[model samples]
Structures are given as structure tokens and as C-alpha cells.
Target: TITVSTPIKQIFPDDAFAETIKANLKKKSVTDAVTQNELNSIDQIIANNSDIKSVQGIQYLPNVRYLALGGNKLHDISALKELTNLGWLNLSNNQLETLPQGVFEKLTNLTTLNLSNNQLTSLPQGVFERLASLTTLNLSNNNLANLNDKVFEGLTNLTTLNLSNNNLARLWKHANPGGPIYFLKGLTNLTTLNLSNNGFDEFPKEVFKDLTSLTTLNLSNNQLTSLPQGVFERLTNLKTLNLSNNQLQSLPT
Candidate 1:
């Protein structure tokens, strides 16, 4: 089924557009890539485990653009190399050890890549160099010890980044001698960040002070026992803050 994520309150806004799409997609066979029985089995597994392994009929739709195979044990997607027209791709919750170099070179039109909840120790060097149109990237809940800062060197248009719930201890423990945790700077267009559930023994004010445009900050369930002075000083634009389930003693001003 073609799942539409557009807001429902819009009502009749995309009715005609959706009808036109349905008219064209009705003749499309959902069993071309996989059988109905296989699809149902996958759905049942997802309902119980919260992940998707394969597409219902991805290869069949040669002209298909959107593919969301989030959740499962998908280690590689190189088989989809022929889908040169693919736009949106979600491969969340799998055993992806590392991004295959040139895996996305042909998908020049790809807009999003979600690889959360995986075993990604490091991104392939310059892996995203060709996906120039990428807008959103989620790397939460992974084994990413440290991104090659250069990993995002050219993604000037990136809007959202989620690096929460990983291991960020050395940046605070070994790198800086009694310094703050705001080691990550740059990315002027960043709007939302989730650094929650990490190795932050304390909320470093210097780390988030320069984030002028950041709107949502999630630092919940971490090792933080206290906040640094002027922690919230530079967060003038922050609208939501999550500090739940931490060892924080007080919110420093």
C-alpha cells in the first residue's frame, strides 16, 4: 500500500493528486518483488519486533521512487543498484557494519537516508559525497564512537541530525582537560539535535552555547550529574528541552 504521510487536517488538498496516483498505481503488481504471503509474514514479524526486512515488491516497480525498508537485519542494499530513480530510502534497524562506498552514487536523486539502530562504527569515507540532495540523516542508537568530522563536511544543506544515545566519552574525558562538551561546531543550518543517553557526565555549556538556530535538544537519560554555568545562556531559540531520567542535581543558570 502507498502510505501517505501528509497531514490529515489538510482534508481535500491532495485528494485529486492522490486519486491520480492511485489510478496509475492500481495496475502495478505488489507481488512482482514479493508474494502476498511473504508480505504478510514480514508485516507480522514487524508487528512483533518493530522492523522491516524487505520490500513487498520493490524490484517489480522499476520506476518506483520511494522505498522504506526500515527495521530488520538488512546488512547491505547493493542489490538495489539498478533503481537509479529512487528518491527516498530508509534502512533503519539493521546490521549495517558500514555504508558501502559508491552504494548511493547512482541514486543521485536520493533525498533521505536513515540508518539508525545499527552496528555502524564509521561511515564510509566520503560516502555521501555524491548524494548532494540529502536533507535528513538519523544515526541514533548505533556504535558510532566518533564521526570523522569530515563525514558531514559537504552536507551544507542538511537540516536535521540525530546522534544521540551513542558513546561520546573521550571528547569529554580524554580530549579536553576539564573542558566543556560542545566540541561539535559548524552546521549553521541545524535545527534539531538529540544527544541524549550518551557518556556526558555533565552538561557542558560550551558545547551548546553557539547553537543559535537549534530548536529541539534532547539530553535525557545520560550520565550528567550537573549542568555547567551559562548552560542555557546561548539556547535563546531552544523551544523544547529533554533532561529526564538523568542524575542532574540542578539546572544551572
Candidate 2:
């Protein structure tokens, strides 16, 4: 029953535009009265924000469940730490290279997280450990070469992950060789994954063996010569497949 509220339109005291959003709450698709109540709650909360950057770490506008701070110079996202009840957060396209560990530990109701288009090289072990409630996570388009095996270890509720367009050559390498797929073995709840545009020449078998809930996979634009016999076998729930633009010579079938 959590609600995602739109941003507000405001003029900062420094005469800068902060990309505050404008909402159309009355036009929502949901017609329940409770939904309307939450919508009104958001409207009331957003109306108080004269400026976001000015509020920094103390801005706690109730009913504004979600917030997006993309394309900014914000290096500190700890401002949202007080929003303990928050459910959705989008801090993409920012100057953040790493997140403050446990910054999101209090937002236990969180579901969607977008951290794309950054300069991150790696994530903290158990970075998502507290986000056991997270469903969709987008870490695409970064300088990540190797992801720690324990980075997402305890995120048992994660469903979708976007690791495409990274500098990884393997699944765990931090540089040209990239990272290794062994780090992904513990994400048993993953359903959708994007590993396209990497430098792998062939897919690994051990990685897929641990994924019993995967459905969508993308391995396009890699260095693969051909796929193996059981590469996609363990993923019995797989439905959509993307293997285009690779170095394949022939198919197993």
C-alpha cells in the first residue's frame, strides 16, 4: 500500500533550478479512496519543500514516499536517511561513486532502486544486505569492473538486475578482464538480468546452476564464440532471451 509521489516545482534561494517535479495526482489510474488519501498526503508534503538542496539531510516530508535526484551534483544521499518509511528511491545520473553503507538500511520498505550512470568501481559487501525488500535494482552504465561476491548476498527479494554496459570483462574483474560470474551465484531470487556489452568470450556454467528463478537474460554484444549445452538449462523459468550481436559460430541445436 506504499505510494510513490512526484516531485515539486520550486525556485531555490540561490536562483538555481533543482528539477523539482510537477504532479498530476487527480489523474492517477487507481480510483480507491485510500489511494486518493495518500495522493493528497503527497500533495501536502511536496508543497512544503521550498527547495530540496536547502533541506539536505533534514528533509522529511511525509507521504512523499519516493524521490528522484538524478543528474545532479549530489554526492551525499544521506539526506534521505530520515525518510525511514520511504519505499522507492532514484539517485541515478549523479556524482555518486559509492553509497554510504547502511544509508538505505532504514528504508526497509524500499522496492525499486536506480543508481545508473555513475563512476562506481565496486559496491560494499552487503551493500544491499539491508534491502531484503528490494525488487528492481539498476546499476547499469558504470565503471564497475568487479562486483563483490557479498555485495548482493542477502538481497533475497531482488527480482531484476541491470548490470549491462559495464567495464567488466568477466563477472568479477575490476579492470579490462572485468569480474566473474561466481559473485552472482547467491542471487537465487533473480528473474531478469542484463549482462550485455561486456567482454566475455563464453558463458560460464556454474553461475547459472544457482539461478533457479531466472526468466529473462541478456548476453548480447559480448565476446562469446558460442553457447554451451546447459547454459540456459538450469533456468527453467526463462522466457525472454537476448543473444544478439555476439561472436557465435553456430548453435548447439
Candidate 3:
């Protein structure tokens, strides 16, 4: 038990609207009161479902490795910017509409990120630039419509990506006339991708050329009437494909 008698306002300068976080580290056992210096050795913090709305005091634990803060009302997580050692994070089922830049810039060791069930419309460029070690990402069930070409450019090591049930019809709209494949251009390591129910009507030729290692792709429930020629030629490693519920008149030649 680490008692933080200091007012929450003193810890966070710019976050004047944030709520004060009570100090009662969620754990299995209720141990005796721990000193402020002892907070550095702790590696994990499971504060999920704790009714926590603001993570104001969590930044003091600079060495936290695993943080599970899902299932809360958190809209501001600016406190996580200092947890550089964080490796796993879960922020699902929250009311987060957007993230402050540099929030994850220091979490270079992060591997798993769950942003499902939020109100994210677009992610800023360089937001994931430091997450080189990230392997799994979930952006499902969001309102994402447009994505910058460089949004996923830094996730070279990512293997699984879920963009299902999003308004991705305008993804990379600034690119050439054809659908934008540049959004996933740098993610060559991706083996599984879910693009179902995205309202896609057509895809550009060789839009998936860079994803030579892709094995699983889901394009079901779209308005696609046809696919471009040689669209699947580069996906030689593909083992599973879902193109059901489309308006295809003829297969690609």
C-alpha cells in the first residue's frame, strides 16, 4: 500500500480536469503499507474494473511491465506516458475518443495493444512509431474512416491486425484513384488481417503486393462487385480467404 497524500492536481499539471486516483494497488493480497520508494520494484498493476476513471497516479510507478485498465470510464490516459517499461496494455471497453500524442512513444517494449470498443475515428502519424516490438493490435468496432499512410508504417513487426466493422471506405483517400493499400504497405510481417464489413466496392491492382507473407484475409460482407487483376498474385502464402456476401460479377483474371 503506497499512500500518495499529495493532491492529484500537484502531480499532473496540464490535466486540471482529470479526476483524482485513489491509491490502493489492485493485487491478490492486501499487504502492509508500502513505502513510496517500494513502488519502483513493482512490475504489474491490475486495476481493471476498479471504477477508475482517471489514471493520474499511475505514472509514479515508472517500472510497471503489465497494465490492465480496461472496463473503466477512462478518457484520459496521459499518465501512461512515463511507463516506458510497459510491455502489455489493455484499454478496451472505455470511453476514449482520442489519445494524446507521445502517450505510447516511450513504451518501446510494448507487445500487445487492445483498443477495441472505443470511439477512435483516426490515429495520428508517428503515434505507434516507438512500438517496434508490438505484435498484436485490435482496432475493431470503432468509427475509423480515414487513415494516414504513415499510421501503420511503424508496425513492421506486427503480425495480427483487426480492423473489422469500421468505416474504412475512405481509407487513404488522398492516394491514387484505386483503393489505398499504402496504409498497410509497411506491415509486411502481417499474417492475419480482418477487413470484413468495411463497405469496400473494389480494390486496386496489387494493393496487397507488399503483404507477401499474409496467410489469412477476410473481405466478407462488402459491396465489392469485382477484384482487380493480379490482386492475389503477390499473396502466394495465403492459406485462408473470405470473400462472401459480395456483388462479384466475375472473378479476377
lDDT of 3 by residue, 110-210 (tens): 99999988888888768898899999999988889877777887888999999988898765333536546467887789999999988887676645778
**Prediction 2 global C-alpha lDDT:** 0.66
lDDT of 2 by residue, 1-253 (tens): 2254322322112222222322333432232123324334552223222334433412425455766656655566765665766777776776677777777777788888889887787876657777778989998998888777677777788899998888777663334244345767677899999988877775557767777899999989988787768866688898988988988887657
lDDT of 1: 0.61
Model 1 misplacement above 4 A: 1-63, 80-84, 105-108, 174-183, 203-206, 250-253
Comparing candidate 1 with candidate 3, which one achieves the higher lDDT? Answer: 3
Task: Give model 1's TM-score versus the native structure.
Answer: 0.66
Please write out the lDDT profile of model 1 over residues 1-253, one tens digit for every residue: 2243322112212333223223333423322232233322221111113343433333333454666656555666665665667777777777788777767777777777787888887677777767667778788888877655456655555667888778865556534655433434655666788888777775445566556777888888888787777756777778998989888776657
Model 3 misplacement above 4 A = 1-33, 172-181, 251-253
Alpha-carbon shift of residue 215 in model 3 (angstroms): 0.8
Top candidate when judged by TM-score against the true structure: 3
Q: What is the RMSD of candidate 2?
A: 7.9
Candidate 2 TM-score over all chains jointly: 0.74
Best-fitting candidate, scored by lDDT: 3
- Candidate 2: minimum summed lDDT over ten consecutive residues — where? 9-18
